[PDB]
Amino acid sequence: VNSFSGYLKLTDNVYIKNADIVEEAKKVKPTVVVNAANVYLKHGGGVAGALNKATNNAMQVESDDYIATNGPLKVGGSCVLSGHNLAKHCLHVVGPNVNKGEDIQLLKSAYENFNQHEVLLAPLLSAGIFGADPIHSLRVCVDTVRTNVYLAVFDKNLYDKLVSSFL
Ligand SMILES: NC(=O)c1ccccc1O
Protein backbone atom coordinates (compact mmCIF):
# COMPACT_ATOMS: atom_id res chain seq x y z
CA VAL A 1 0.00 0.00 0.00
CA ASN A 2 1.17 3.62 -0.72
CA SER A 3 -0.10 7.25 -0.07
CA PHE A 4 -1.25 8.09 -3.64
CA SER A 5 -5.02 8.90 -3.71
CA GLY A 6 -7.69 9.46 -6.42
CA TYR A 7 -5.75 7.84 -9.31
CA LEU A 8 -7.41 5.87 -12.10
CA LYS A 9 -5.62 2.53 -12.68
CA LEU A 10 -4.62 2.10 -16.36
CA THR A 11 -2.53 -1.08 -16.06
CA ASP A 12 -0.90 -3.37 -13.49
CA ASN A 13 1.70 -0.61 -12.79
CA VAL A 14 0.52 2.72 -14.29
CA TYR A 15 -1.92 5.10 -12.61
CA ILE A 16 -3.14 8.56 -13.75
CA LYS A 17 -4.78 11.60 -12.13
CA ASN A 18 -5.77 15.19 -13.12
CA ALA A 19 -3.46 17.02 -10.72
CA ASP A 20 -0.84 19.72 -10.39
CA ILE A 21 2.38 17.70 -9.85
CA VAL A 22 3.67 20.47 -7.53
CA GLU A 23 0.56 20.20 -5.26
CA GLU A 24 0.68 16.39 -5.49
CA ALA A 25 4.36 16.29 -4.49
CA LYS A 26 3.75 18.69 -1.57
CA LYS A 27 0.91 16.41 -0.28
CA VAL A 28 2.49 12.92 -0.82
CA LYS A 29 6.25 13.68 -0.37
CA PRO A 30 7.00 10.73 -2.65
CA THR A 31 10.40 9.02 -2.62
CA VAL A 32 10.83 10.17 -6.27
CA VAL A 33 9.28 13.04 -8.23
CA VAL A 34 10.23 13.16 -11.92
CA ASN A 35 11.13 16.51 -13.50
CA ALA A 36 10.63 17.19 -17.22
CA ALA A 37 14.19 18.42 -17.55
CA ASN A 38 16.34 19.67 -20.40
CA VAL A 39 20.01 18.71 -20.87
CA TYR A 40 21.19 21.97 -19.23
CA LEU A 41 18.86 21.54 -16.20
CA LYS A 42 17.58 25.07 -16.90
CA HIS A 43 14.22 24.93 -15.15
CA GLY A 44 12.53 27.89 -16.88
CA GLY A 45 9.00 26.77 -17.69
CA GLY A 46 6.55 23.92 -17.93
CA VAL A 47 6.78 21.29 -15.21
CA ALA A 48 10.44 22.16 -14.52
CA GLY A 49 9.76 25.85 -13.99
CA ALA A 50 6.85 25.01 -11.68
CA LEU A 51 8.83 22.45 -9.61
CA ASN A 52 11.80 24.80 -9.35
CA LYS A 53 9.58 27.75 -8.28
CA ALA A 54 8.06 25.54 -5.54
CA THR A 55 11.63 24.94 -4.19
CA ASN A 56 12.29 28.72 -4.05
CA ASN A 57 14.99 28.22 -6.76
CA ALA A 58 16.96 25.71 -4.64
CA MET A 59 16.48 23.10 -7.42
CA GLN A 60 18.14 25.51 -9.93
CA VAL A 61 21.04 26.29 -7.57
CA GLU A 62 21.72 22.55 -7.07
CA SER A 63 21.31 21.90 -10.80
CA ASP A 64 23.80 24.62 -11.76
CA ASP A 65 26.43 23.03 -9.50
CA TYR A 66 25.63 19.58 -11.07
CA ILE A 67 26.14 20.92 -14.61
CA ALA A 68 29.31 22.83 -13.66
CA THR A 69 30.78 19.50 -12.41
CA ASN A 70 29.35 16.96 -14.90
CA GLY A 71 28.32 18.84 -18.06
CA PRO A 72 24.96 18.44 -19.76
CA LEU A 73 22.74 15.36 -19.68
CA LYS A 74 21.97 13.36 -22.84
CA VAL A 75 18.55 13.54 -24.47
CA GLY A 76 16.93 10.35 -23.12
CA GLY A 77 19.12 10.48 -19.99
CA SER A 78 18.61 11.42 -16.37
CA CYS A 79 20.23 12.28 -13.05
CA VAL A 80 19.08 11.92 -9.46
CA LEU A 81 19.25 15.10 -7.35
CA SER A 82 17.54 16.29 -4.21
CA GLY A 83 13.76 16.51 -4.04
CA HIS A 84 14.08 19.55 -1.75
CA ASN A 85 10.69 20.27 -0.08
CA LEU A 86 8.78 18.20 -2.66
CA ALA A 87 10.14 14.63 -2.43
CA LYS A 88 13.14 12.68 -1.15
CA HIS A 89 14.71 12.70 -4.63
CA CYS A 90 14.07 14.36 -7.98
CA LEU A 91 14.76 12.24 -11.04
CA HIS A 92 15.51 14.81 -13.77
CA VAL A 93 14.62 13.05 -17.05
CA VAL A 94 15.23 14.54 -20.50
CA GLY A 95 12.61 13.60 -23.00
CA PRO A 96 13.09 14.74 -26.60
CA ASN A 97 11.84 18.26 -27.30
CA VAL A 98 9.94 18.20 -30.66
CA ASN A 99 10.13 22.09 -30.71
CA LYS A 100 14.01 21.58 -30.96
CA GLY A 101 13.73 18.73 -33.59
CA GLU A 102 14.88 15.79 -31.32
CA ASP A 103 14.24 12.10 -32.25
CA ILE A 104 10.88 10.98 -30.73
CA GLN A 105 12.35 7.38 -30.59
CA LEU A 106 14.38 8.81 -27.66
CA LEU A 107 11.14 8.96 -25.64
CA LYS A 108 11.38 5.21 -24.89
CA SER A 109 14.98 5.66 -23.65
CA ALA A 110 13.77 8.55 -21.43
CA TYR A 111 11.05 6.40 -19.84
CA GLU A 112 13.54 3.53 -19.26
CA ASN A 113 15.10 5.71 -16.50
CA PHE A 114 11.91 5.22 -14.46
CA ASN A 115 12.66 1.48 -14.18
CA GLN A 116 15.55 2.26 -11.77
CA HIS A 117 12.97 3.40 -9.15
CA GLU A 118 10.27 1.20 -7.57
CA VAL A 119 7.67 4.02 -7.28
CA LEU A 120 7.55 7.48 -8.92
CA LEU A 121 5.31 10.53 -9.23
CA ALA A 122 5.80 11.80 -12.81
CA PRO A 123 4.50 13.94 -15.65
CA LEU A 124 4.08 12.64 -19.17
CA LEU A 125 7.52 12.99 -20.76
CA SER A 126 7.87 15.19 -23.81
CA ALA A 127 4.29 16.54 -23.34
CA GLY A 128 3.34 20.19 -22.84
CA ILE A 129 5.99 22.65 -24.07
CA PHE A 130 8.22 19.72 -25.24
CA GLY A 131 5.80 19.39 -28.18
CA ALA A 132 5.08 15.62 -28.35
CA ASP A 133 1.59 14.08 -28.58
CA PRO A 134 0.64 13.24 -24.95
CA ILE A 135 -1.43 10.23 -26.15
CA HIS A 136 1.78 8.83 -27.65
CA SER A 137 3.74 9.65 -24.49
CA LEU A 138 1.22 7.70 -22.37
CA ARG A 139 1.44 4.69 -24.73
CA VAL A 140 5.28 4.68 -24.54
CA CYS A 141 5.07 5.02 -20.75
CA VAL A 142 2.74 1.99 -20.44
CA ASP A 143 4.83 -0.07 -22.83
CA THR A 144 8.22 0.86 -21.24
CA VAL A 145 7.88 1.46 -17.49
CA ARG A 146 7.58 -1.71 -15.39
CA THR A 147 7.83 0.01 -11.97
CA ASN A 148 4.89 1.74 -10.33
CA VAL A 149 4.26 5.15 -11.86
CA TYR A 150 1.70 7.73 -10.75
CA LEU A 151 1.15 10.20 -13.60
CA ALA A 152 -0.07 13.74 -12.83
CA VAL A 153 -1.75 15.50 -15.77
CA PHE A 154 -2.24 19.26 -15.14
CA ASP A 155 -4.82 19.93 -17.86
CA LYS A 156 -8.33 18.49 -17.09
CA ASN A 157 -9.30 18.51 -20.76
CA LEU A 158 -6.18 16.50 -21.69
CA TYR A 159 -6.65 14.13 -18.72
CA ASP A 160 -10.17 13.26 -19.95
CA LYS A 161 -8.91 12.75 -23.52
CA LEU A 162 -6.02 10.49 -22.30
CA VAL A 163 -8.42 8.28 -20.29
CA SER A 164 -11.15 8.14 -22.96
CA SER A 165 -8.67 7.22 -25.75
CA PHE A 166 -6.58 4.72 -23.69
CA LEU A 167 -6.31 1.26 -25.22
N1 LIG B 1 2.65 21.08 -15.09
C2 LIG B 1 2.84 22.48 -15.28
O3 LIG B 1 3.12 22.90 -16.33
C4 LIG B 1 2.63 23.41 -14.08
C5 LIG B 1 2.39 23.01 -12.79
C6 LIG B 1 2.21 23.99 -11.81
C7 LIG B 1 2.21 25.32 -12.08
C8 LIG B 1 2.44 25.70 -13.36
C9 LIG B 1 2.64 24.74 -14.32
O10 LIG B 1 2.87 25.11 -15.60
Cα(102) to centroid(ligand 1), Å: 23
The Cα–Cα gap between 130 and 32 comes to: 21
164's enclosing H/E stretch is: helix 156-164
Q: How far apart are CA 160 and CA 167, in angstroms?
A: 14
Q: For residues 113-139, b (16+ Cβ closer than 10 Å) or e, as one string?
A: bbeebebbbbbbbbbbebbbebeebbb
Q: Give the range of the structural domain holding residue 37, as residue numbers without chain letter.
A: 1-167
The DSSP letter of residue 123 is P
Choosing from 22, 59, 125, 156 the residue with most ligand 1 atoms within 8 A of its CB, the one to mutate for a pocket test is 22
CA angle, 126 as apex, 124 and 129 as ends, to 5°? 105
Name the DSSP class of 131. Answer: -
Number of neighbouring beta carbons within 10 Å of residue 85: 13
Q: Give the resolution to one decimal, in Å.
A: 1.0
Q: With 0-12 CB in 10 A as exposed, 13-18 as middle and 19+ as buried, what is 82?
A: middle
Q: How many domains does the chain have?
A: 1
In the chain, DSSP finds a helix count (H) and a strand count (E) of 6, 7
Count other Cβ atoms within 10 Å, centred on residue 49.
15
Ligand 1 pocket mutation pick from 17, 18, 20, 158 by most atoms within 8 angstroms of CB = 20
Technique used by the depositors: X-ray
Q: Which ligand 1 atom is at minimum distance from the Cα of 123? A: 1
